[PDB]
Design a protein around this ligand. Structure first.
Ligand SMILES: Cc1cc2nc3c(=O)[nH]c(=O)nc-3n(C[C@H](O)[C@H](O)[C@H](O)CO)c2cc1C
Ligand SMILES: Cc1cc2nc3c(=O)[nH]c(=O)nc-3n(C[C@H](O)[C@H](O)[C@H](O)CO)c2cc1C
Ligand SMILES: Cc1cc2nc3c(=O)[nH]c(=O)nc-3n(C[C@H](O)[C@H](O)[C@H](O)CO)c2cc1C
Ligand SMILES: Cc1cc2nc3c(=O)[nH]c(=O)nc-3n(C[C@H](O)[C@H](O)[C@H](O)CO)c2cc1C
Ligand SMILES: Cc1cc2nc3c(=O)[nH]c(=O)nc-3n(C[C@H](O)[C@H](O)[C@H](O)CO)c2cc1C
Ligand SMILES: Cc1cc2nc3c(=O)[nH]c(=O)nc-3n(C[C@H](O)[C@H](O)[C@H](O)CO)c2cc1C
Ligand SMILES: Cc1cc2nc3c(=O)[nH]c(=O)nc-3n(C[C@H](O)[C@H](O)[C@H](O)CO)c2cc1C
Ligand SMILES: Cc1cc2nc3c(=O)[nH]c(=O)nc-3n(C[C@H](O)[C@H](O)[C@H](O)CO)c2cc1C
Ligand SMILES: Cc1cc2nc3c(=O)[nH]c(=O)nc-3n(C[C@H](O)[C@H](O)[C@H](O)CO)c2cc1C
Ligand SMILES: Cc1cc2nc3c(=O)[nH]c(=O)nc-3n(C[C@H](O)[C@H](O)[C@H](O)CO)c2cc1C
Ligand SMILES: Cc1cc2nc3c(=O)[nH]c(=O)nc-3n(C[C@H](O)[C@H](O)[C@H](O)CO)c2cc1C
Ligand SMILES: Cc1cc2nc3c(=O)[nH]c(=O)nc-3n(C[C@H](O)[C@H](O)[C@H](O)CO)c2cc1C
Ligand SMILES: [Cl-]
Ligand SMILES: [Cl-]
Ligand SMILES: [Cl-]
Ligand SMILES: [Cl-]
Ligand SMILES: [Cl-]
Ligand SMILES: [Cl-]
Ligand SMILES: [Cl-]
Ligand SMILES: [Cl-]
Ligand SMILES: [Cl-]
Ligand SMILES: [Cl-]
Ligand SMILES: [Cl-]
Ligand SMILES: [Cl-]
Ligand code: NA
Ligand code: NA
Ligand code: NA
Ligand code: NA
Ligand code: NA
Ligand code: NA
Ligand code: NA
Ligand code: NA
Ligand code: NA
Ligand code: NA
Ligand code: NA
Ligand code: NA
Ligand code: NA
Ligand code: NA
Ligand code: NA
Ligand code: NA
Ligand code: NA
Ligand code: NA
Ligand code: NA
Ligand code: NA
Ligand code: NA
Ligand code: NA
Ligand code: NA
Ligand code: NA
Ligand code: NA
Ligand code: NA
Ligand code: NA
Ligand code: NA
Ligand code: NA
Ligand code: NA
Ligand code: NA
Ligand code: NA
Ligand code: NA
Ligand code: NA
Ligand code: NA
Ligand code: NA
Ligand code: NA
Ligand code: NA
Ligand code: NA
Ligand code: NA
Lengths: 63, 63, 63, 63, 63, 63, 63, 63, 63, 63, 63, 63
């Protein structure tokens, strides 16, 4: 059985690096992370000193 | 990194109050709740004594 | 077996009350109404004297 | 010909009142506003002193 | 309030049995499981000795 | 001209048998049933003694 | 309250004429037809002597 | 950079002519119109003396 | 078994004629073409001397 | 690099068996078939002597 | 109230840089730009000397 | 007439480079490649020694 957690990673560099930020956090806290699906992307501008790319992923892990 | 939980709030009064019901529960159990996105709305009729509005939200919190 | 009818309720007060308007009409004419799913919301402005909220629902009833 | 503008209204009271907030602004600045379609709803929590309902609408006006 | 977990069940027999695999796991670990919604189906071929049906479900439980 | 009715079939055995349950009911009551499209699938757990598969179909018939 | 019926019109000439075919049938059988929304278009080739355009519409009428 | 405006053209003749009605208006008022994407189609019946086809397009122009 | 090819037809006359352009090409090169589903429509303006309607279809053929 | 072909399998028995029918055909004609994603399901009634389940899959293979 | 403009940025380097191209143009011409949502990505090949990445964003600004 | 092939490119570096991987393969094997549309993105983790970005594109070519 696989389970997914819905995480939004952030990066001041790129959408790819924002995806990695989410996956890194999943791997810190979960065993058997197997894949991620991108479900949304966006950019924070107003509330941040530097433009911040965000990539939201469903991160799948095996139970 | 943000994480989302998928909750359905309920209310005998309105869709807005059903959204609040979900968010209230998230805030009882989670720190750093930052926003909610509505993803579905509906109404329970058959199994309830009073019509019950439901609002399903992804509730985002900062990790 | 359940069957659904696709109804748009209207209200000069709220989206919740427009949903109720549709469900009320279903219950006038159908037995065993069990639930409703919201599928669209909108607001009439041009053709009405007062802004009118509309909520479209699939209303499910048991056959 | 109709044209639509994509506006997000806000309210500390309800999703219906947030829709009205957007439509009010359209009517301040545009002639011949005819209807609005709801396209998204959400709730601001983290950055606001009071929970704030948001309703995003395409507001249609006749050219 | 209901909460949903996003699980992918697997089966060498059918999509129905893969849905049951996910629901069985939810019931092992959660109280008050009330319903499941199918959100995706697929088939593993390359990495498995036998074709494996997968059914992804949001499994709802009452809090 | 074809017309569609939106029906949810149920079965304690499979999603295929739940689709058949809906189509059977359409054929009891309608002439010239020609095809069905699956639009949703789910599983009832909380309110039923046995897990019950549901398959919702648009059932098309020729007028 | 408005209600919609889901009809597929057909034409050997165009998608517009197929939409009209559905609406014509609705007007034969229903009072107060007010609008139609196109929800699908396609073309029959295999089972027909002449290519046949199809346009599926939700046809709304006032109750 | 391209920008899009969301316009609904109308025609008493066809969906193609309704698309042209929107594009014509864009070209009256904008330089460097490059393409249009159809995003919705419908038919006005209740409020018009003659059935009126509508085609909604995102009309893209180069800045 | 049916297979689909994803083709975009073009026409200086109409969306219906653009659909026919795609289907004609499929029939030139494939046996047993059975139906087509419209999946997108658009209009070329910038790169063409005359406005050009495009209709994208999945064209199904029996293997 | 993976490539997908869009196939509709058929079966007089079940949606699972219809998926297998498509995958079997892909494996007859392609090397390195790795997975399939279900994208649609339906049932043929009018043109067939026996109800026929159909399952449409994108079948992925490694190039 | 927030308003969104629908812009397609372009870049010969990456999808992230194409998003920035759109946002840069919004900031040249608008006050109070607060966020951007990615809604589409693509690549120009035929009409350009160098492959050109495009990222379409709704860019939100506060009124 | 344009035709599209549905390809998933892969890269150990970025989503942009994964899109290029797919397009490169299309250009190896097809004449008159004109554009690509991104339709999905994801990340392989479990089965690969290094995290691998994937970008799925419809690659359009002129017939
Ligand atoms: C992708 C994205 C989407 C956002 N959407 C919203 C929104 O719908 N409403 C809102 O008040 N703020 C939103 N914000 C936050 C907004 O830019 C700002 O920080 C304040 O919260 C409101 O000006 C969003 C930020 C990002 C990065
Ligand atoms: C929004 C909503 C959706 C529902 N959908 C279903 C359903 O698909 N199937 C079902 O058996 N009951 C459903 N129910 C519950 C149903 O109304 C009733 O309580 C029994 O579970 C079946 O009659 C739903 C209830 C709500 C509020
Ligand atoms: C949610 C909603 C959507 C509408 N969409 C349309 C439309 O697409 N075209 C149209 O002519 N009128 C539409 N109307 C009606 C319109 O506001 C007005 O009453 C006249 O029919 C046209 O100005 C709509 C009304 C509502 C409430
Ligand atoms: C509906 C809604 C959606 C939002 N989405 C985002 C988002 O995707 N990313 C983000 O950084 N902030 C988002 N925000 C703003 C967020 O709650 C907060 O104000 C800061 O901008 C980030 O903590 C959103 C706010 C609202 C009301
Ligand atoms: C439904 C489904 C979807 C899949 N999608 C992918 C994918 O997008 N990329 C991938 O590398 N492997 C995917 N795989 C796994 C793939 O078949 C194989 O096991 C290796 O991971 C890559 O050949 C998928 C497997 C299944 C069952
Ligand atoms: C597919 C499906 C969806 C359902 N969705 C809901 C829902 O959204 N809300 C609800 O109160 N009950 C829902 N129910 C019914 C629920 O499981 C239970 O019977 C009671 O109605 C609420 O616990 C659903 C049942 C099924 C089979
Ligand atoms: C828009 C459209 C969609 C169709 N889809 C299907 C389908 O999914 N399966 C099928 O057996 N026949 C389908 N047919 C009918 C098919 O072309 C033919 O008449 C036989 O029913 C099967 O070859 C479709 C026909 C049209 C016009
Ligand atoms: C495509 C289309 C969609 C429409 N949708 C609505 C609607 O949702 N609600 C409404 O009151 N009127 C709607 N109208 C207008 C409606 O037909 C009539 O003119 C009055 O506005 C209500 O009877 C629509 C008109 C068109 C052409
Ligand atoms: C339906 C349609 C969609 C198009 N989309 C794009 C696009 O996203 N980006 C682009 O550079 N050109 C696009 N073009 C082509 C564009 O109009 C023009 O020919 C040049 O390629 C760019 O100005 C499109 C053309 C059509 C007909
Ligand atoms: C899933 C499915 C979808 C279909 N859709 C259509 C359609 O849209 N139009 C049509 O004429 N026939 C359609 N058919 C075929 C139809 O049932 C019958 O065989 C004749 O082609 C028309 O009565 C479909 C068949 C199946 C199995
Ligand atoms: C993302 C994207 C989508 C496009 N879609 C189309 C289209 O649908 N039709 C078209 O003629 N050209 C399209 N073009 C432009 C096409 O590649 C070329 O420049 C000419 O306009 C037609 O060969 C598109 C370009 C891009 C970048
Ligand atoms: C985007 C993506 C989606 C995937 N989806 C699935 C899936 O649904 N099921 C599966 O068994 N493996 C999937 N895989 C492959 C999975 O990570 C692993 O390689 C094995 O195939 C199962 O652990 C996917 C891989 C990628 C890159
Ligand atoms: Cl989710
Ligand atoms: Cl409300
Ligand atoms: Cl419907
Ligand atoms: Cl706009
Ligand atoms: Cl979750
Ligand atoms: Cl099954
Ligand atoms: Cl109906
Ligand atoms: Cl036409
Ligand atoms: Cl495809
Ligand atoms: Cl828009
Ligand atoms: Cl293909
Ligand atoms: Cl990138
Ligand atoms: Na989730
Ligand atoms: Na930096
Ligand atoms: Na988002
Ligand atoms: Na921000
Ligand atoms: Na009350
Ligand atoms: Na729901
Ligand atoms: Na109920
Ligand atoms: Na219906
Ligand atoms: Na009032
Ligand atoms: Na609507
Ligand atoms: Na109106
Ligand atoms: Na208040
Ligand atoms: Na939003
Ligand atoms: Na906030
Ligand atoms: Na077995
Ligand atoms: Na999936
Ligand atoms: Na596999
Ligand atoms: Na049994
Ligand atoms: Na459902
Ligand atoms: Na239940
Ligand atoms: Na003719
Ligand atoms: Na269809
Ligand atoms: Na046919
Ligand atoms: Na005329
Ligand atoms: Na519309
Ligand atoms: Na009308
Ligand atoms: Na001409
Ligand atoms: Na397109
Ligand atoms: Na063009
Ligand atoms: Na394809
Ligand atoms: Na049999
Ligand atoms: Na289909
Ligand atoms: Na049939
Ligand atoms: Na817009
Ligand atoms: Na460069
Ligand atoms: Na696009
Ligand atoms: Na190009
Ligand atoms: Na590397
Ligand atoms: Na995918
Ligand atoms: Na993997």
């Amino acid at each position: 059985v696989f389970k997914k957690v819905l995480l939004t990673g952030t990066s001041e560099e790129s959408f790819t690096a924002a995806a990695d930020d989410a996956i890194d956090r999943a791997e810190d806290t979960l065993d058997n992370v197997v894949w991620a699906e991108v479900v949304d992307q966006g950019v924070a501008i107003g509330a941040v000193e530097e433009r911040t790319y965000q990539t939201e992923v469903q991160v799948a892990f095996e139970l």
